[PDB]
Amino acid sequence: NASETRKAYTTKMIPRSHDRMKLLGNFMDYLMDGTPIFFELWNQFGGGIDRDIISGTANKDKISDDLLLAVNWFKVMPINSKPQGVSPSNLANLFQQYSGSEPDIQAQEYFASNFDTEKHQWKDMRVEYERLLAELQLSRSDMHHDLKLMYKEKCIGLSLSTAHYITSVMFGTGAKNNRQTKHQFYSKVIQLLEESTQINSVEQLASIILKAGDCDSYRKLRIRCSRKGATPSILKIVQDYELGTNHDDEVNVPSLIANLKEKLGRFEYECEWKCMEKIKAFLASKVGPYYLGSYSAMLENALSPIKGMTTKNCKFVLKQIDAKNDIKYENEPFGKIVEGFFDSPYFESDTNVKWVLHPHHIGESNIKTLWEDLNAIHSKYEEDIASLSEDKKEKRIKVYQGDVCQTINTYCEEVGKEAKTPLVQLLRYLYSRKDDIAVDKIIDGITFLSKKHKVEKQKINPVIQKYPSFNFGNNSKLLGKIISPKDKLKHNLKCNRNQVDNYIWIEIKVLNTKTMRWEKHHYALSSTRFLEEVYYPATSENPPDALAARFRTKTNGYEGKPALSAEQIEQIRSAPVGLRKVKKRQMRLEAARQQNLLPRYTWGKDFNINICKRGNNFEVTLATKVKKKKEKNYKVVLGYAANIVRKNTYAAIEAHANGDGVIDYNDLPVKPIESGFVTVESQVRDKSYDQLSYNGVKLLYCKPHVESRRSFLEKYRNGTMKDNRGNNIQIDFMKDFEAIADDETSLYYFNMKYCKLLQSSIRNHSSQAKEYREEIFELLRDGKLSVLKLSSLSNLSFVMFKVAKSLIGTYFGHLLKKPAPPITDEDKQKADPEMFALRLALEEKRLNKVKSKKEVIANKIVAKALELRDKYGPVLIKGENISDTTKKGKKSSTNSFLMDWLARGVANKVKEMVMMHQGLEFVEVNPNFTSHQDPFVHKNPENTFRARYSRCTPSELTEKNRKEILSFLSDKPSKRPTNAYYNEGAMAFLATYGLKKNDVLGVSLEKFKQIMANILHQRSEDQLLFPSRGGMFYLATYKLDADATSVNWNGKQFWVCNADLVAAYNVGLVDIQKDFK
């Protein structure tokens, strides 16, 4: 029920004397250079593992003694690594030779794993182990003795101990406790418990431990049996009894005996090493004298990839075995028939090169409907010619042959509308062998080919060394500390300096590479965020209390916007533009402390100092653990719906509600509390712009720029295109340009759209790429209305960045060609560095735009939950669980559109953020039917689904809308469950407006519009509702949307609400019962 997370603060290193920063850098260089030594050594230790080393263990979970050995003996690593490479063919032979037996299925699957042949190769770690023995002159029996002890101590194997512990037991020369003493003592405790198994009091239990230890006190007991180290749980019982905090605690004799029996194995030996002195000597030669902190720090970096990749690879092998078990090899013959397409005459290749077949190549399970249509044509064609005795009807069948093509051609094109277009030739070939293979078998065969290729291509994880980071702290690490604010105050008072500053100091014990001795030194850091939320001190007496959350942030209740003195204001106006932003923040900081507005921050040695040295740059990070206690007594449920182009929404439901609006949900009283859209507003001149929806200024205020763009297009407005045998069409892009140049259009849409048109222009003028160069810089870079200068967090702004990157791609590709060595970033940078920089600037800008959107959306969701929690109580935030949206069976455009969703990225941020607050919990839920369920009716107790609707005026009606509505009236059946809702909803539209299909069907759009206008005018309404997939509105039984208007739909009264607001309620209601007893 205890949760732990870390909050990190990045900082800037504020340098000191070159010589002072040189000493720190030299130390950092020392740990980094040494780290690869431990990695090579531990890999070698892994090679020494054998059956006599892992005989009778827990072997983690669902693992095989063989797999544990194979992962240690053989690893996939870079080709240029020191360990000798081995061919995958010899893996089984080497395993048998070392093992003395053949490898099992798990070991075999491991060897079978895919990897990049060009970048990595298998390495024989066993051979590396021999190198250690030969190089260090070690007895095989002696190293084996040490290896066995290391395994018991968790220095090697599946579950590893901390680097600090491993270094201490392996290389420590400090006084160690006597294991024999603990072993007799633990056995005696077990013995008395067996002798008196019915005790049910801690008091009886504490007496037994003391009897076992032959002592009257825990202190005396600890001195004899566990002289040094943390207190064991058994002794902890005696201790807590003396302080009387465990008197009423439940006693379980079997468990105490069982836990004690498990810990017995570790005390059968005294840890007397035989090769540690030699090994320490080799290490000393390569990394210098043994120190616990330095050796431990290097080992931690070395051990992480070795231990982590072993865990990941074992899970991977087990998953792969299961995936292979899932494949139906019994369907392999059917796959052969389907795969026979390449050898048929329906597929033609110059080099006869085939490719993998997937379900989307036949339209997945739709081929079943198509087969039926084909059979009806065939059965009708048989009867026709059976009762068409007259000969010379070759055309009858020839006509039937043509009908088959059109049936397939229609099928492919129809499936192609909402998905990838299936292959006509493949389908024609399959119909030829219709007698040969059943249709269901075809799907099964095509699925087997696709599934087997996917599982077979999965790659193993290579073992790659880490780029090291070193940690300084109060305990179990390199000694380090952040000077405390009180210490800071004292320091400045003793130096006769101003009481407060904006710099942070740390004192860390560092090694002098020259003297090879430890020294403590001070280093200065700078991090306004750390100062504001932690470090700056509340000097005033009677300062506000520390917040429930430690950090002093706006979300935590500290507004931090105090009245500024005129002297402070001058400093901001006075400061250079580069420093104005930081100074204003500091001035407010000094203002809130001066005005006693700064809340206190409780200080503890809770901050870790992480230092990373890249070149001469030092990256110091301060991170602290944040503890939280789970609270499962939720009173409010906050649902979150995530959208790509529309606004995200949230809805809160009160639980165990009693009041005017209470609804009884399956015996649970709930009250919809509120719903809303997630928007991030930024103020400008008493004007606020939502960062998630702003699409840019209208063109009329951008007339020079739009006209400036027009002048360039005019020079290259001559573009040729060929469609439907339309070669040398002499297409004009400027016509298309004006369509987007309307003053009513948003700038971002214009800029994104202009990029595409420019993209097409370059395609026509392939040898005139160079000319667009300067226009691109003004469009994306230098221009005042350039993409880099103005952009929002809206979906359209992101697409604009997408098109801009593609456009640069086109300019580079066209810039180089035949009139073959391949173009690389090196060539493009050489050919055009400025443009190359522009691509990087756009990439870096988009990544910073994406990080922000995730953080700002996360804060709004967390802020609402915190607001609801204070008024009502513990809140459970629920978000849709979105996964596997990008698939190869979907159109690339659909996949490209889906990539910008960011739902998982936002949820991970919310999930991480929720961990810092008590009374807040986050879980993901199934999003199935969340857009079509009538909230608070559906599942109370009946199933209630309704279609999404669009609203517009008769002039706004489009042919697409007209077609959509009719399709819904089709009697053709569908696998999509939601299809029923649209047909049912489409029925209401005819019923509600007194129409008949004949009026909608076979009617010009214009005439259809007139019909709809005459009805609306009679009813005194200007807008009409129609069911549209992805519709903006939902007819809800309840008034979930505050701006909803009641309407009578087909004899029923519903509230027209934003569909997204409805969805947020639906998300909250998914498995709502499980959340409450």
Added chain:
RNA sequence: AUUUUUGUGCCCAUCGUUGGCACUAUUAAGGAAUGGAAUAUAG
């Protein structure tokens, strides 16, 4: 231990009135997608 000029970023035809905001860091691989140039296909 004193640097006094900066933690990282986000928004805007008006870049400031004290403009308005937000935020866990790192390592490494893997999975699934995308862009551009082109080739082969069937229209």
Added chain:
DNA sequence: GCTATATTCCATTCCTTAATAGAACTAGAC
């Protein structure tokens, strides 16, 4: 009606999963 399938070669993005960011202690050194 932006033709679609597939492939090659150069680049990208969004996300997941293995890790790091130790706790409690005391003999002996200030």
Added chain:
DNA sequence: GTCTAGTTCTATAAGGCAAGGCGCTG
């Protein structure tokens, strides 16, 4: 009295498929 620099510590159920959850713009 504190603090450092080393040691040892741990604590031990629920559907199958696959659609659903997303947007366009002329």
